[PDB]
Design a binder for this molecule. Structure first.
Ligand SMILES: *C(=O)/C=C/c1ccc(O)cc1
Length: 107
């Protein structure tokens, strides 16, 4: 996975670094969130863009994965947007490039 195929994925896909800063953000995720990729890239996913994820079930799982070198998690979650609660399944894992990590979002 590491362009037009990337924005056409059936699942949402976000690439972050070890401190949480967004490097890649696809269109499928933009469609599920309402966020434009250009103002979101360069900002921190956990502290700025998606604060609802700043709990031990999500950001804690991310922090532990980075600190142990291997990020590998699969869990159910619910995104608390302005309109209504959107139930999703999250898949977190490492990338082919060092210091880079992936967050996959489905449904
Ligand atoms: C909670 O604050 C979730 C926010 C959110 C999740 C995923 C995105 O792509 C954008 C915002």
């Amino acid at each position: 996975i590491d362009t037009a195929e990337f924005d056409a994925l059936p699942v949402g896909a976000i690439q972050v670094d070890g401190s949480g800063v967004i490097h890649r953000y696809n269109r499928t995720e933009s469609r599920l969130s309402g966020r434009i990729p250009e103002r979101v890239i360069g900002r921190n996913f956990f502290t700025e863009v998606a604060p609802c994820t700043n709990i031990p079930a999500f950001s804690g799982r991310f922090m532990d994965g980075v600190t142990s070198g291997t990020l590998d998690a699969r869990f159910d979650f619910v995104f608390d947007f302005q309109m209504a609660p959107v139930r999703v399944q999250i898949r977190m894992q490492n990338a082919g490039v060092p210091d880079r990590y992936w967050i996959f979002v489905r449904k």
